[PDB]
Amino acid sequence: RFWRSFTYFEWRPTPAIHRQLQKIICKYKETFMKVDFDPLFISHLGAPKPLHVSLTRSLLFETEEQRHVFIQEMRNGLRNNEITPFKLQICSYPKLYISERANTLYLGLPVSECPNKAQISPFKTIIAEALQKSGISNYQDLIVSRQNLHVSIAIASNPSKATLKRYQQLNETMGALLLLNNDFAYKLEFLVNSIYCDENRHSIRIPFN
């Protein structure tokens, strides 16, 4: 019906990292079980698939012109804030995140707040400003909070209304157990050279500098 977008960083994990993400997923599910998860970085034919960090929810633009202004203002905001490439640090301990339409659960890795703070802080006002300029003035609910930034690495197969209802309480229970049970000793990070704004047709890559 409309002209949608959403904004993200992309990660193309190497086979070395695939192996680590697979271990994380297996050990989480071991700890959980005493629901199944499919990896998001492997396709159904067994090929690599990119991961991402979502910086916004879905952005509904009623006109193609408004979405265009958004994308221009993203680029302008990046140029004026002098954004250059940086590495983004990713936590090795996962938790559950609810999908945007709330019927799916993902196993995700937090984008850790403290070591990325200086790198990530500018994007909030850059996005907020591009959103307001393009007609979305109620932007607060659309920009992902720093504490919710994450990379989904698996999708829960076949959840349950009850399990979906109580995912946050499951997170409390599992978070405690993961610290007692599991020892995820991986140094996860990736280079961010650009930011993407999706469109149905194709994803617009906006280079930094």
Author numbering: 73 to 106, 116 to 290
Sentences reproduced from the published study:
Despite low sequence identity (<20%), the structure of yUsb1 is strikingly homologous to that of human Usb111, with nearly superimposable active sites (root mean square deviation for H/S in active site=0.3 Å). NE2 of H231 is 2.8 Å from the sulfate ion, while H133 is farther away (4 Å). Our crystal structure reveals that residues 73–76 form the start of a β-strand and make several intramolecular contacts that are likely important for folding. In yeast, this position is a phenylalanine (F78) which cannot form an analogous hydrogen bond. Indeed, mutating F78 to alanine causes a slow growth phenotype in vivo and a >300-fold reduction in the rate of processing in vitro. Yeast Usb1 catalyzes two distinct chemical reactions: (1) exonucleolytic removal of a terminal uridine (“first step”) and (2) cyclic phosphodiesterase (CPDase) ring opening to leave a noncyclic phosphate (“second step”).
Post-transcriptional exonucleolytic processing of U6 is directed by U6 biogenesis protein 1 (Usb1), a 3′–5′ exonuclease belonging to the 2H phosphodiesterase superfamily of enzymes. The highly conserved U6 snRNA coordinates magnesium ions in the active site that are required for splicing catalysis. We determined the 1.8 Å crystal structure of the catalytic domain of yUsb1, and a 1.4 Å co-crystal structure of hUsb1 bound to the substrate analog uridine 5′-monophosphate (5′ UMP). Here, we have demonstrated that two members of the 2H phosphodiesterase superfamily, yUsb1 and hUsb1, are mechanistically distinct, yet are involved in the same step of U6 biogenesis in their respective organisms.
